[PDB]
Amino acid sequence: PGRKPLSHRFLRHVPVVYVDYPGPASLTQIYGTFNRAMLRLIPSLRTYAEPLTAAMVEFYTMSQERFTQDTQPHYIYSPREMTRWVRGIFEALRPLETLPVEGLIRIWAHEALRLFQDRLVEDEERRWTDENIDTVALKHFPNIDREKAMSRPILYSNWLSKDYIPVDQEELRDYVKARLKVFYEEELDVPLVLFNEVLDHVLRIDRIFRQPQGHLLLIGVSGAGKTTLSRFVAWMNGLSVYQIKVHRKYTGEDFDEDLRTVLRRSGCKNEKIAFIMDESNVLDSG
Amino acid sequence: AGDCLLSAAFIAYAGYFDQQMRQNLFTTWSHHLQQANIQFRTDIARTEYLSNADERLRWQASSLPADDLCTENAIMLKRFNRYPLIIDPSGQATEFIMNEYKDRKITRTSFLDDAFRKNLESALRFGNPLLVQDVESYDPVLNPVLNREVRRTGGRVLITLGDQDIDLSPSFVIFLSTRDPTVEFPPDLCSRVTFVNFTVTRSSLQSQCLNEVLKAERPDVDEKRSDLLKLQGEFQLRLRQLEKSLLQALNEVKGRILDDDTIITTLENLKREAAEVTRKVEETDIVMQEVETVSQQYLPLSTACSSIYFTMESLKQIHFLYQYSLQFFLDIYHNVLYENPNLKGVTDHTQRLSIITKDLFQVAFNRVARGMLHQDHITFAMLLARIKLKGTVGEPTYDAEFQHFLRGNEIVLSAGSTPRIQGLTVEQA
Amino acid sequence: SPALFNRCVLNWFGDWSTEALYQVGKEFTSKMDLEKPNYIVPDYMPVVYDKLPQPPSHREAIVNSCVFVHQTLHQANARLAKRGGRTMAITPRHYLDFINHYANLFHEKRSELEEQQMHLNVGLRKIKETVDQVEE
Ligand SMILES: Nc1ncnc2c1ncn2[C@@H]1O[C@H](COP(=O)(O)OP(=O)(O)O)[C@@H](O)[C@H]1O
Numbered sequence: 001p002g003r004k005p006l007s008h009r010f011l012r013h014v015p016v017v018y019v020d021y022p023g024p025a026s027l028t029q030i031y032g033t034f035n036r037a038m039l040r041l042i043p044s045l046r047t048y049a050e051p052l053t054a055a056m057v058e059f060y061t062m063s064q065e066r067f068t069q070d071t072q073p074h075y076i077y078s079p080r081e082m083t084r085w086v087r088g089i090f091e092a093l094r095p096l097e098t099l100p101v102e103g104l105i106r107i108w109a110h111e112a113l114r115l116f117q118d119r120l121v122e123d124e125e126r127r128w129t130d131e132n133i134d135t136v137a138l139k140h141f142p143n144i145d146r147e148k149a150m151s152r153p154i155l156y157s158n159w160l161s162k163d164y165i166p167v168d169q170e171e172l173r174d175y176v177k178a179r180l181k182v183f184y185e186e187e188l189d190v191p192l193v194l195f196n197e198v199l200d201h202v203l204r205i206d207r208i209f210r211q212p213q214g215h216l217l218l219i220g221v222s223g224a225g226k227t228t229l230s231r232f233v234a235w236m237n238g239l240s241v242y243q244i245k246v247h248r249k250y251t252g253e254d255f256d257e258d259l260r261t262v263l264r265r266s267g268c269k270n271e272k273i274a275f276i277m278d279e280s281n282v283l284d285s286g
Numbered sequence: 287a288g289d290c291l292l293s294a295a296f297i298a299y300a301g302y303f304d305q306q307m308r309q310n311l312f313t314t315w316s317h318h319l320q321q322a323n324i325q326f327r328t329d330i331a332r333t334e335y336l337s338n339a340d341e342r343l344r345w346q347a348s349s350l351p352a353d354d355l356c357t358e359n360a361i362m363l364k365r366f367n368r369y370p371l372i373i374d375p376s377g378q379a380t381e382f383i384m385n386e387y388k389d390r391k392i393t394r395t396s397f398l399d400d401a402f403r404k405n406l407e408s409a410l411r412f413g414n415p416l417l418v419q420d421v422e423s424y425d426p427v428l429n430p431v432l433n434r435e436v437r438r439t440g441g442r443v444l445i446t447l448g449d450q451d452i453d454l455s456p457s458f459v460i461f462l463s464t465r466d467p468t469v470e471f472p473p474d475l476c477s478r479v480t481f482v483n484f485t486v487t488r489s490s491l492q493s494q495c496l497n498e499v500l501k502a503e504r505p506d507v508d509e510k511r512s513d514l515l516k517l518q519g520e521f522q523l524r525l526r527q528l529e530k531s532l533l534q535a536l537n538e539v540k541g542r543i544l545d546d547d548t549i550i551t552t553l554e555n556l557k558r559e560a561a562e563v564t565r566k567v568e569e570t571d572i573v574m575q576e577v578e579t580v581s582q583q584y585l586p587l588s589t590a591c592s593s594i595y596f597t598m599e600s601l602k603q604i605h606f607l608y609q610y611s612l613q614f615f616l617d618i619y620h621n622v623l624y625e626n627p628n629l630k631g632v633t634d635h636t637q638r639l640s641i642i643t644k645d646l647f648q649v650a651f652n653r654v655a656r657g658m659l660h661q662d663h664i665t666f667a668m669l670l671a672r673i674k675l676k677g678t679v680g681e682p683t684y685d686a687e688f689q690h691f692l693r694g695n696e697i698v699l700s701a702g703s704t705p706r707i708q709g710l711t712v713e714q715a
Numbered sequence: 716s717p718a719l720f721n722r723c724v725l726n727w728f729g730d731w732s733t734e735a736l737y738q739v740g741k742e743f744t745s746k747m748d749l750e751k752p753n754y755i756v757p758d759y760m761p762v763v764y765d766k767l768p769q770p771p772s773h774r775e776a777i778v779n780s781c782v783f784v785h786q787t788l789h790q791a792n793a794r795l796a797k798r799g800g801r802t803m804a805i806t807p808r809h810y811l812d813f814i815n816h817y818a819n820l821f822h823e824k825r826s827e828l829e830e831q832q833m834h835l836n837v838g839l840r841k842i843k844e845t846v847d848q849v850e851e
Contacts, residue, residue: 001716001717002716069717073717073720074720074725076717076720076721078721080721080722084724114724115724118724118725118726118727119724119725119726119727120727121727121729187437189436189438191742191743193738193739193742193743195731195732195734195735195738195739196734196735197729197731197732197735198735201726201728204726205726208724208726213723213724214722214723215722215723215724216723216724216726217719217720217723217724217725217726218726218728219725219726219727219728220727220728220729220730221473221728221729221730221804221806221807222473222474222476222477222804222806222808223477223806223807223808223809223811224728224729224730224731224806224807225728225807226728245427245429245430245446245447245448245449246426246427247403247425247426247427247448248397248425248426248427278474279472279474280426280429280474281426287749287773287777287821288780290817290820290821290824291777291780291781291784291817293820294813294816294817294820295781295784295813295817297816298809298812298813298816298817299784299785299788299805299809299813302803303791307791307795310791311787311788311791314787315780315783315784315787318760318780318783318784318787319780321757321759321760322757322760322776322779322780323754323755323756323757323776324773324776324777324780336820365816365820367812367815367816368808368812468801471803473803473804473806476803476804476806477804477806477808477809478808480812481803526831529838533838533841536841536842536845537841540848541845541848541849543849
């Protein structure tokens with residue numbers, strides 16, 4: 001979508017090549033190099049670098065086999081997903097030391113859940129993916145104890161303790177309840193009642209915010225709570241919130257200006273910015 | 287609790303739906319509450335539970351139709367949390383909502399004008415209401431006020447409009463209003479309004495038609511159903527006011543034995559009222575049953591009436607000159623109820639109903655055909671004829687015969703088309 | 716846009732589940748007085764599979780009725796879409812609006828009825844005093 005075929009008068013001069021997604025062998029090699037570099041931080045797991053990488057590649061394969069663009073437009077899959085997978089695993093492993101294979105596979109499964117499961121729509125797809133992750137973990141790691149995969153919460157949060165560590169659902173629920181008490185005590189006077197889904201979403205939003213990424217796009221029905229949770233998480237992590245209040249006579253030069261304002265408040269000043277906006281703000285493809 | 291749940295679900299969810307859909311949803315909710323044994327008052331009417339008589343008379347004096355759907359919509363406009371969005375092909379709702387808030391100096395505006403912003407904050411400062419027309423081109427600048435965000439700080443209420451910051455004056459209400467019944471709103475704007483629908487459908491027009499014919503032909507049944515409607519809250523309020531008058535009289539006269547006569551009359555008067563109310567309660571079901579039968583007696587005509595009117599509207603398809611409005615059919619019905627030469631001395635209720643039906647068909651056909659092309663007259667007749675066939679009893683629907691006559695003749699049966707006899711031709715065969 | 720749909724991480728904030736609606740109803744209707752000791756326990760009416768008590772009491776019955784109302788609205792929208800069309804989307808903000816209206820209307824009705832009852836009691840006491848005066 002949004003692509004126009006080039007004129008034959010211009011295509012005559014320019015040769016073109018088709019750069020397809022790297023094949024299974026290329027993917028295995030490229031991310032095996034990354035895994036072998038990453039796992040050198042803790043020498044206790046070096047010999048498990050080769051299967052883990054393969055597991056990732058294997059998972060990606062069926063994660064590319066189903067979720068075609070016909071089913072849903074956002075069901076796309078590229079090596080960028082594997083890159084974010086490796087980067088997230090490395091980010092979690094960076095401050096922590098002396099980890100057994102238990103923690104490695106636990107965080108591998110957690111990253112798989114956050115990258116290949118939260119984008120899905122219908123429940124059968126979600127349970128299919130969860131079954132796929134646990135089966136693949138058993139296939140390339142049958143020697144491991146079934147103590148990490150069956151863990152149904154499998155949620156991490158650095159809010160408790162001092163680093164990115166697995167946390168029980170109930171204690172995190174109590175902590176986030178206290179923090180949200182403090183939250184709507186200060187602005188957003190409307191009460192916020194927390195179910196399971198909002199807890200999952202605040203954890204995911206915080207995980208995306210913490211990493212040095214560039215965006216976090218939310219897909220869902222109106223009033224479901226995307227914006228309020230975005231603001232709440234921004235309040236947790238000390239993220240300033242910028243809302244562009246568009247109108248009928250709004251011009252793209254204004255969008256360039258406030259983009260530059262966000263960029264200067266984020267880069268020239270180390271203040272971390274969470275700039276939130278919706279469809280009513282977008283008018284043209286510019 | 288159950289009655290409250292039903293009323294709230296109606297005034298919050300049962301918007302944008304026609305009268306039949308609202309009734310169906312209410313029936314489903316009440317059936318579920320019965321399944322859950324939640325004590326909700328049987329056969330409650332939401333028209334008077336959410337507003338007593340006084341508001342109804344004020345709305346009627348405020349240029350509002352007596353339609354049941356219109357009364358429910360007025361209730362929705364009176365009790366709303368999210369700012370309403372009025373949908374009405376006619377201007378009755380807009381005129382009603384102007385006339386209702388003349389004291390609060392309601393202002394008119396629209397999205398298309400360039401001064402919508404200016405009168406918007408001008409209404410925002412003095413707590414002035416703002417009705418905005420032509421909602422199809424929605425202004426995103428209305429998002430902060432629809433979400434009712436309050437940036438209260440320093441003991442005062444504030445709001446952000448674009449780069450400007452304004453003081454949110456209380457007693458400020460905004461009523462969104464549209465003209466086109468066929469428009470698809472984005473879900474973001476849909477979630478922020480309580481849809482109030484004034485569009486006339488088959489069920490709403492049938493209800494209006496039945497109410498009018500009941501009021502005209504049998505005023506006694508109309509009085510009985512109005513009495514049933516008032517019996518929930520209005521009679522109790524009147525009895526309470528009479529009791530308060532009794533109390534003030536008693537404490538003013540200190541119960542003097544010389545004043546006893548003036549007390550006694552009042553007392554017995556009150557008893558009579560109570561007795562009357564009690565009698566009404568003791569006959570409620572019976573009265574209800576009677577009304578039902580009368581409705582079941584007048585149900586066909588109303589349905590036919592509805593059908594007829596919609597046929598008239600659909601007549602715009604054949605020719606561009608056949609545009610007809612609800613006012614025309616309402617005039618036709620008013621003529622066929624009151625100004626009838628055939629109803630000068632008729633007294634039998636069933637005979638009056640038959641005469642009304644026949645003369646309605648006749649007058650409708652005549653008035654439509656006076657402004658119709660000659661080649662179409664017969665067409666219209668058949669349509670009314672078909673309606674009559676649907677309205678009559680003791681006759682088969684003839685659905686298969688009519689489907690064959692209209693569209694069933696064009697089916698694939700060319701195979702085995704024998705010439706048959708010399709009289710038959712190939713097309714005849 | 717496949718490019719934007721790949722350049723970031725996508726999260727499907729789907730519609731509120733039945734458990735979410737039930738919890739929202741329970742927390743937003745807590746201040747209300749809905750304790751009926753003599754509430755008989757019906758059969759059937761499943762809406763929330765994880766009913767907090769196996770035999771539901773009045774409060775859980777009411778919140779179950781509220782979530783059932785929301786699901787019936789969803790089903791009515793789906794049915795109207797199937798037969799023809801012309802349906803507006805139903806969102807959890809509608810559920811919040813429904814709960815807020817129900818709470819406010821219950822408070823108003825209960826306050827009015829209690830005021831009428833207290834007026835009745837005041838009248839009873841005053842008329843007893845007048846009866847004593849008449850006896851004297
Ligand atoms: N978990 C929740 N509990 C209570 N209310 C919620 C919850 N999530 C969302 N809301 C309500 O939704 C309303 C608006 O949500 P919003 O962030 O605008 O949703 P969206 O991002 O879909 O537009 C808020 O007023 C808030 O009260």
